[PDB]
Amino acid sequence: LLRDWKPENPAFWENKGKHIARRNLWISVSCLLLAFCVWMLFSAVTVNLNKIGFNFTTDQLFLLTALPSVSGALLRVPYSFMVPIFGGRRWTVFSTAILIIPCVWLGIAVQNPNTPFGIFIVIALLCGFAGANFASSMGNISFFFPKAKQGSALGINGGLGNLGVSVMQLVAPLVIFVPVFAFLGVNGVPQADGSVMSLANAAWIWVPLLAIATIAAWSGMNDIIADQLPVLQRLHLWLLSLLYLATFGSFIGFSAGFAMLAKTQFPDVNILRLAFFGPFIGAIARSVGGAISDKFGGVRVTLINFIFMAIFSALLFLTLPGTGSGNFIAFYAVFMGLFLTAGLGSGSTFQMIAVIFRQITIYRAHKEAVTETAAALGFISAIGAVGGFFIPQAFGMSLNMTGSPVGAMKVFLIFYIVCVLLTWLVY
Predict the structure, then answer these.
(1) Which protein family is named in the record?
(2) Residues 358 and 247 in one domain
(3) Do 232 and 152 share a structural domain?
(4) Closest C-alpha to 392, from 60, 8, 108
(5) DSSP string of 170-208?
(6) Cα Rg for the chain, rounded, in angstroms?
(7) Are 215 and 31 in contact (CB under 8 A)?
(8) N or C terminus of the chain: which is more exposed, having fewer CB within 10 Å?
(9) Are 231 and 356 members of one domain?
(10) DSSP 324
(11) Is residue 273 within 8 Å of 173, Cβ to Cβ?
(12) How far is residue 395 from each of residues 63, 64, 132, 218, 313, measured CA to CA in Å?
């Protein structure tokens, strides 16, 4: 417990503040990165699941990758309010050890080729629990940095927690072709050209790394509905929460979907070998986009951006085999552009919402607008994660009813266009 914590005063900070804050920042970043690794796990397990003994339909796999985001987008609003109670250490220790549950469990189901779809539901859920660790890891570290250094630190904290998608989607398809836990009896299943596939690996790998990050959480970290429900009801928390759906939502959605979509249209290719550039270029462009959202205009960048997500989305139609050039590289490039503008906008829309909530709602109110803005950020991120349920669920429900991704893709055009015209009109 840190009694007497006043970090604003340059003296206290420079002498014995910034070192506490920095340590807490690095522990916080490792736990967030792993939480994202676990959160988006299914995105690279499902592409392999039917290769291992299972017989799951396409709509089922897409439902699996889209399912976690339903549990994460709903638990962020409680997780944020959970930190000023147990402390951002005991609630990092706890909120990080309970991921061992779905990791060790998912390592178990994947071995049994007779296990029911119903079990992978509750594992998709419990896996989705580690997407609420963003809200709590973002609430917790703010106290550690001066009211005028919370820009850089939050940027590093969230901005690296993101990277965990990109990391997991690269560690996981690389480790399965190595019998690391064969001494424990982990099933491996042979495939063309010597490929032996132990697919519990991609799930049991994180049990050690999550342990270490739990102990360091217990060792190195320090414990230091009222106005929120007000801030919510204003009818401009909604047309804004929508734009962060089309940006951040479509970094999550495409993160869960892209591996699998690129499996159905192009079975002859090996996507796990290169599905990760997406989420990586995504995080980088995101935190790059945050920096130019206030250095070249807020609304401007979001606009010119959505124009590019709409043009990319329409461009997607000309690559799918059958309804256009059945070429993979073009499909890929267009998806990279999709991730790029998704992250770029994902930032451009956040600093925008900021300078429209500590601005338009700072005139009615100089330290009380900070509250409303904050609450609006919590909401918008939480209702920003339920876009990672939608996109792969629409690829699912399009491949199910029609066999094609076209039925969902058109909805994506319509969405990006309406979004463009709504950035146009109001803001």
Answers:
(1) Belongs to the major facilitator superfamily. Nitrate/nitrite porter (TC 2.A.1.8) family.
(2) yes
(3) no
(4) 60
(5) HHHHHHTTS-TTGGGT---EEETTTEEE--SHHHHTHHH
(6) 22
(7) no
(8) N
(9) yes
(10) B
(11) yes
(12) 9, 12, 24, 41, 14
The answer to whether the beta carbons of residues 282 and 162 sit under 8 Å apart is yes
d(CA 279, CA 163): 7
Q: Which domain holds residue 78?
A: 1-224
Determine the Cα–Cα distance for residues 273 and 271; give it in Å rounded to an integer.
5
CA quadruple 213, 128, 347, 93: dihedral, nearest 10: -20
Residues in the chain whose C lies over 2.5 Å from the next residue's N (breaks after): 224, 364
Domain boundary among 190, 224, 258: 224
Technique of determination: X-ray
Q: Same domain for 350 and 324?
A: yes
Kindly report the backbone phi and psi dihedral angles of residue 138, in degrees, each rounded to the nearest multiple of 5, phi listed first. Answer: -95, -30
How many domains does the chain contain in total?
2
Alpha helices in 67-162 (DSSP H): 68-72, 76-97, 100-109, 117-128, 133-142, 150-161
Mark whether 158 and 272 lie in a shared domain: no
Q: How many CA atoms lie within 13 A of 232 on its CB side?
A: 11
In this structure, are residues 369 and 361 in contact, taking their beta carbons and an 8 Å threshold?
Answer: yes
